[PDB]
């Protein structure tokens, strides 16, 4: 039971160390950097990763799966903190580091380091790299290992997804989703990376910002995300590479199965059909409110600023190319509410994926119709066939658990000395995996108290794991 | 359809006018007061109520029922503002008046009049009288006319819920629930009223505060609710007469059926069995946090202050016998969240009645068990027999609609110049029919903007009607 689990753990710790080399390689390829902590970590982890599985090389085979994936982030997230503790260039506390470790790996993007512009170019690669690794992590888990467990978030998902579209050669439940999806992952990171080079910026910022936009990310090598270069091209690439990277990757599986027959696979998936409309209606209303307010002198800037902010905040991306200066207070609030409807399910993703909201809007209106025609029979339209009552329950129990954690995690931040508004601005930003505080006056996560910076870590996991995955850990039935 | 409806409307307007006489009678038995607007209103309404139903005395017989009850409060609520508009002693504006009219009739209890202590003793009776009238209104509706409609929210409400326990006969409806329930209503108001006299206070404050506790309103003839006389008896009577008045009145029908066989009827109802635990655990935790904080010098006051505040805020009563001075900021927030768990269904109460929460807690844990045992068959325990899938749907669509209105009504108050925190403090206080703003000693409803007071009226109805009753009004299927 526990034995073969620790085999998996030490095995991944070793694999994490192999990742530590690529940062330190840059701290010697580049001339601005510090490599000793990465190579100090590479060794100590390889040992501590090896020490656990050598006496445990004994192999043996649901209760197994929930406890693995909370260890997959607990173990790897803690290990991620080590480089920051050692390096004195950003002398930063332990909890500030564990936070930045989790915030990176969990693809959150909430930072606690001030003035990272001039920080070494070696620690600046490791932060963005950890988002890439957690970017791959969510994909392999969301589409493969996690659905089987019982929490899907994947079109029709309860525990029965063959991917529906091109459900072929699915035999290896995870061994051909990690292999096949990587090519989409790499072919997406490079395309944007060289595109940023064609926008003009340095190779480093060109690449290490692709690690950040392809995965849900949110990170930057500049304090301001994409205001470093207020150029329409970079925004218009970051916009299209968040919309393309946000939706179901099994719909990006419309390219690796007999070439490019995309449009039928994409548009006939109701989740993508609602991802566009929710994305358009947001930017559309966030545009007319800017034009009516004359917040920006020329409607090209307003178009640029809005169309990026709605698609960087509703996709859980977390990129801030503005300060909402001329924006009504009433816009950062609306955008934060739009954070819940994050990227389409099965992808680097927000708190309640489009379907969870789509299923929620569908079912909520049926409850409005039945009120007049009580003796009528109604069904759900989303897919080809109406949903099983299991899935409709698995959405509405997910909303309940969500607003159960979000309230307990809130009265937990209030007690540590924060204020009602800042707590809400924090947990809604971490439960959904959106780094920005998002208010007219932002939350800057350095000011957050030490004990809260733990509750935020506790919370950003809850969002990254489907909330139930960790909520059942403290159930009596599971143990 | 509309013809016989206006007959009902003008018929009720006449009955409302007959109510106007009792206040003015006090403004002549007392002569510290102004009675002319009540007698001016009595006439003008009687005409305007009679003018509609005389040419419409034509009699004729679900779509009928939803449109009646939005008129029962829209019409009566507007008519309630008239006395305040006419009288110059309040010097109250129109929107301040419509608000105080609705706040009174909707049993909300949120006031916009400063220094009502020295206001005339005639207008001071009318405010409490309107809470009494809306106190009776919810009872006849919730137990009788509303359940038939399909939004009963009373035990196993859904459409079919014909009297629940000791439901014998029941063929006459509204009319066999308006007559019989009045005796409980009157026999409960007098009992507290003379009890306040035995506490020592004046007849007026003794009586006109009974109209308010029984109707779960929260009004007062003093700016401070029950701090006017910080006596344990008045608190301990107001506590016990809110707990007794908050529970199911169909369970208070355990006294008019062959004498006093109470305890079996009461305790075998799971709503009352959860009303106690939720009420105890609240006050229990709201007490230990006061004792650990030394907010009050002697633990008898802390017991007095706490045990009153948890049972005046989580029963939607809205009485304030304190200023939360020595209370942590983190206590008014927790109490405000407890407002959503309003009084038991079938009684004058707040938004998500115990069952809605009880059903929600029941179902939310089942979804946690199934995650480990996917192939198991689970059911709901609440009653004798498990609930139909219709009812479980009718709670989870109610939570969805609730947090759909609560967010639109919030981004509607934000735009009118309020702040994020005060909006939440306002709509959660009005949607739940609470009254007091709560928070770190905050909302005073005079400061609220003119176009927010309208939205607040828009909201306090949404809570008083079961949210769907008015939400379907704007559906295409209903029209």
């Amino acid at each position: 039971q526990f034995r073969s689990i620790i085999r998996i753990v030490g095995l991944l710790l070793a694999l994490f160390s192999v990742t530590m080399l690529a940062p330190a390689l840059v701290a010697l390829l580049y001339r601005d950097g510090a490599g000793v902590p990465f190579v100090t970590t590479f060794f100590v982890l390889l040992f501590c990763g090896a020490m656990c599985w050598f006496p445990n090389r004994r192999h043996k085979h649901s209760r197994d799966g929930f406890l693995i994936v909370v260890l997959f982030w607990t173990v790897l997230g803690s290990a991620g903190s080590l480089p920051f503790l050692i390096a004195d260039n950003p002398n930063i506390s332990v909890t500030d580091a564990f936070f930045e470790s989790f915030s990176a790996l969990t693809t959150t993007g909430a930072t606690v380091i001030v003035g990272l512009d001039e920080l070494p170019k070696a620690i600046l690669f490791y932060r963005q790299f950890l988002q890439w690794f957690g970017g791959m992590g969510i994909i392999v888990l969301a589409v493969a290992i996690l659905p089987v467990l019982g929490i899907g978030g994947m079109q029709l998902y309860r525990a029965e997804i063959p991917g529906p579209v091109k459900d072929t050669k699915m035999t290896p439940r995870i061994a051909e989703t990690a292999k096949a999806l990587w090519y989409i992952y790499l072919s997406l990171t490079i395309a944007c990376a060289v595109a940023f080079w064609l926008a003009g910026m340095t190779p480093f910022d060109a690449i290490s910002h692709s690690f950040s936009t392809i995965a849900i990310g949110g990170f930057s090598t500049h304090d301001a995300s994409m205001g470093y270069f207020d150029s329409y091209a970079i925004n218009l690439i970051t916009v299209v590479f968040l919309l393309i990277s946000a939706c179901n990757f099994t719909l990006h599986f419309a390219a690796f199965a007999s070439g490019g027959v995309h449009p039928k696979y994409y548009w006939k998936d109701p989740e993508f059909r609602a991802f566009i409309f929710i994305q358009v209606l947001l930017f559309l209303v966030c545009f007319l409110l800017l034009l009516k307010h004359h917040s920006y002198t020329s409607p090209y800037d307003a178009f640029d600023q809005a169309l990026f902010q709605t698609v960087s905040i509703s996709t859980t991306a977390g990129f801030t190319t503005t300060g909402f200066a001329d924006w009504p207070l009433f816009l950062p609030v609306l955008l934060l509410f739009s954070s819940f409807i994050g990227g389409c399910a099965g992808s680097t993703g927000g708190g309640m994926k489009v379907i969870r909201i789509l299923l929620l809007t569908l079912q909520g209106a049926r409850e409005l119709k039945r009120l007049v025609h009580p003796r009528a029979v109604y069904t759900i339209k989303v897919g080809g066939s109406a949903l099983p009552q299991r899935v409709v329950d698995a959405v509405w129990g997910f909303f309940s658990a969500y607003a159960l954690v979000f309230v307990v995690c809130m009265l937990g931040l209030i007690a540590t000395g924060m204020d009602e508004l800042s707590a809400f601005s924090a947990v809604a930003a971490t439960l959904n995996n959106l780094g920005p505080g998002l208010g007219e006056v932002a939350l800057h996560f350095g000011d957050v108290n030490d004990k809260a910076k733990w509750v935020l870590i506790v919370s950003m996991l809850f969002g990254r794991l489907e909330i139930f995955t960790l909520l059942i850990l403290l159930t009596p039935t599971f143990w | 359809q509309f013809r016989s409806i206006i007959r009902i409307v003008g018929l009720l307007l006449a009955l409302f006018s007959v109510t106007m006489l009792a206040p003015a009678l006090v403004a002549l038995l007392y002569r510290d007061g102004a009675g002319v607007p009540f007698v001016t209103t009595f006439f003008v309404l009687l005409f305007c109520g009679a003018m509609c139903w005389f040419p419409n005395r034509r009699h004729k017989h679900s779509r009928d029922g939803f449109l009646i009850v939005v008129l029962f409060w829209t019409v009566l609520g507007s008519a309630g503002s008239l006395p305040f508009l006419i009288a110059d002693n309040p010097n109250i504006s129109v929107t301040d008046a419509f608000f105080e009219s609705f706040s009174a009739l909707t049993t909300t209890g949120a006031t916009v009049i400063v220094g009502l202590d020295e206001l005339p003793k005639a207008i001071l009776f009318y405010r409490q009288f309107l809470q009494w009238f809306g106190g009776m209104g919810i009872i006849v509706l919730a137990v009788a006319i509303l359940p038939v409609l399909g939004i009963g929210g009373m035990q196993l409400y859904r459409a079919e819920i014909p009297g629940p326990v000791k439901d014998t006969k029941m063929t006459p409806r509204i009319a066999e629930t308006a007559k019989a329930l009045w005796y409980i209503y009157l026999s409960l108001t007098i009992a507290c009223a003379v009890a306040f006299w035995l506490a020592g206070m004046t007849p007026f404050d003794a009586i006109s505060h009974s109209f308010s506790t029984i109707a779960i309103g929260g009004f007062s003839t003093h700016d401070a609710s029950m701090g006017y006389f910080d006596s344990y008896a008045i608190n301990l009577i107001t506590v016990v007469f809110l707990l007794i008045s908050a529970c199911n009145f169909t369970l208070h029908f355990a006294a008019f059926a062959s004498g006093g066989v109470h305890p079996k009827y009461y305790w075998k109802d799971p709503e009352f069995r959860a009303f106690i635990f939720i009420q105890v655990l609240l006050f229990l935790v709201c007490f230990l946090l006061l004792l650990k904080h030394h907010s009050y010098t002697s633990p008898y006051d802390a017991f007095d202050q706490a045990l009153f505040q948890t049972v005046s805020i989580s029963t939607t009563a809205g009485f304030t016998t304190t200023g939360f001075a020595d209370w942590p900021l983190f206590l008014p927030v927790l109490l405000l969240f407890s407002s959503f768990i309003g009084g038991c269904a079938g009684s004058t109460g707040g938004g998500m009645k115990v069952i809605r929460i009880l059903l929600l807690t029941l179902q939310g844990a089942r979804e946690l068990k199934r995650l480990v045992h996917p192939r198991a068959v689970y059911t709901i325990k609440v009653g004798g027999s498990a609930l139909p899938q219709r009812v479980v749907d009718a709670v989870w669509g109610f939570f969805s609609a609730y947090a759909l209105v609560f967010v639109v009504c919030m981004l509607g108050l934000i735009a009118t110049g309020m702040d994020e925190l005060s909006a939440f403090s306002a709509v959660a206080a009005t949607l739940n029919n609470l009254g007091p703003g709560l928070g770190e000693v905050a909302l005073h409803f005079g400061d609220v903007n003119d176009k927010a007071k309208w939205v607040l009226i828009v909201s306090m109805l949404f809570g008083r009607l079961e949210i769907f009753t008015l939400l379907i009004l704007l559906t295409p299927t209903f029209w």
């Binding site: - | 192939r375 068959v377 059911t379």
Partner: protein, 448 residues
């Protein structure tokens, strides 16, 4: 007076007649009746019509139809118009039990004694769980004495040892081997017999102290903790309603609409929806930690092919419910540890009412020709051949061996040095049942 030629009526009609008692059976099924008429007088009958029932009863009650409702009418027709004595009538449908007190303790319905089959088997199954390691538990007319059967394996304290080699110590509470079943056929216990592997060693034990016996022989394994069932029918639900309070129950029902009511009726039980052979469900729900796998379905084939699987995965124990009672020995032993029969338990209860005050009471241990019996010795030494004479000095018919003696409320284990006193209930093991009216004639008192 009976009304059946079924396994109940046929097994009775065979067991009860030793010329000691006289009866008349009724059945519209001629080919089965005159076959069952061999095994006395046969009244061909239509329902409970008085012509057949009522006329047969006076001047010339057990009612075992397909249905309960027909049976109730027959006891009322006999009670209303003749006022007949006794009247035992089987009633299966649960609700007639659920309101039994209201109905029956009001005297409305005339059943003097009930035989509710679903209740008897489910109480019995709980009786095995209580003593872990017991294959079968045998009940006699006297509640005080009872046999407990165990299984001898390689490495057991009882394999290969000489019987008398265990009789040299009498530690604390004592026992005695009254029967030995091996290979399906019966071996009567002797001093020369050796306990080979995979035997059904039937120990004697006072009903009060059964657990004490099995722990002194080191055979009382750890108490069962986790149980698994497979039937959602009348026996499956009754057993769950009895075990969820003391044991960790899991149920498997393949009919949803019935799986839902089991979720309502059972508060602390986990009922499922699946077929018994669903390997995924058995693996997914931790069957390698099951202690016993009761299978209580309609088809005996399904119980076996599923209880064989649960042992294979495997469970610690397995139990099936072979509906017809004729094969209990055949399926039992080996892979499937225990096999239960309702028609070797329904008939077990009927032979305790009929035989009341008689010379012999036929035990629940009837399998094949072998059956355990309890014989009553009336009369002082002057009017009885078998009273006062020591056990070793009774010229019992071949195969018969005395195992114990019940005197009032105290169980005396049979020893060769024991004296049979008057009005005793002697417990013994017959290998061959054709000898009863020899025993029935031996113990029976001579004319008074």
């Amino acid at each position: 007076i009976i009304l059946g030629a079924g396994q109940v009526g046929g097994t009775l009609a065979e067991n009860l007649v030793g010329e000691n008692n006289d009866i008349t059976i009724v059945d519209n099924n001629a080919d089965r009746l005159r076959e069952l008429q061999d095994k006395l007088r046969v009244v061909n009958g239509h329902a409970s019509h008085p012509d057949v029932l009522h006329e047969a009863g006076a001047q010339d009650l057990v009612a075992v139809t397909n249905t309960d409702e027909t049976n109730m009418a027959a006891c009322q027709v006999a009670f209303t118009l003749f006022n007949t004595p006794n009247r035992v009538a089987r009633i299966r449908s649960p609700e007639y039990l659920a309101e039994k007190e209201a109905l029956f303790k009001s005297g409305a319905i005339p059943v003097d004694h009930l035989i509710a089959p679903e209740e008897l088997v489910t109480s019995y199954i709980e009786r095995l769980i209580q003593y872990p390691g017991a294959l079968q538990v045998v009940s006699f007319a006297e509640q005080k004495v009872s046999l407990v059967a165990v299984k001898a394996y390689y490495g057991g304290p009882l394999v290969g040892n000489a019987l008398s080699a265990l009789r040299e110590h009498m530690p604390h509470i004592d026992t005695r081997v009254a029967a030995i079943f091996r290979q399906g056929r019966p071996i009567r216990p002797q001093g020369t017999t050796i306990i080979e592997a995979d035997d059904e060693v039937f120990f004697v034990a006072a009903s009060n102290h059964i657990r004490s016996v099995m722990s002194e022989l080191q055979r009382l394994e750890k108490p069962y903790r986790r149980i698994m069932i497979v039937g959602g029918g009348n026996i499956g639900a009754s057993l769950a309603k009895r075990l969820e309070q003391t044991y960790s129950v899991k149920l498997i029902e393949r009919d949803y609409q019935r799986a839902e009511k089991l979720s309502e009726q059972l508060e602390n039980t986990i009922v499922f929806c699946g077929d018994a052979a669903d390997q995924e469900l058995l693996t997914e729900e931790n069957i390698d930690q099951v202690d016993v796998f009761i299978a209580l379905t309609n088809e005996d084939e399904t119980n076996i092919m599923s209880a064989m699987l649960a042992k294979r995965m495997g469970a610690k124990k397995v139990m099936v419910l072979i509906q017809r009672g004729a094969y209990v020995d055949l399926v039992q032993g080996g892979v499937i540890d225990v096999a239960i029969s309702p028609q070797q338990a329904t008939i077990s209860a009927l032979l305790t009412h009929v035989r009341r005050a008689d010379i012999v009471n036929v035990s629940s241990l009837r399998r094949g020709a072998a059956e355990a019996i309890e014989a009553v010795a009336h009369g002082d030494e002057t009017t009885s051949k078998v009273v006062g004479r020591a056990i070793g000095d009774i010229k019992l018919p071949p195969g018969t061996t005395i195992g114990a003696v019940v005197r009032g409320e105290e169980v005396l284990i049979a020893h060769d040095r024991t004296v049979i006193e008057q009005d005793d209930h002697v417990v013994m093991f017959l290998v061959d049942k054709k000898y009863v009216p020899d025993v029935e004639a031996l113990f029976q008192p001579s004319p008074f």
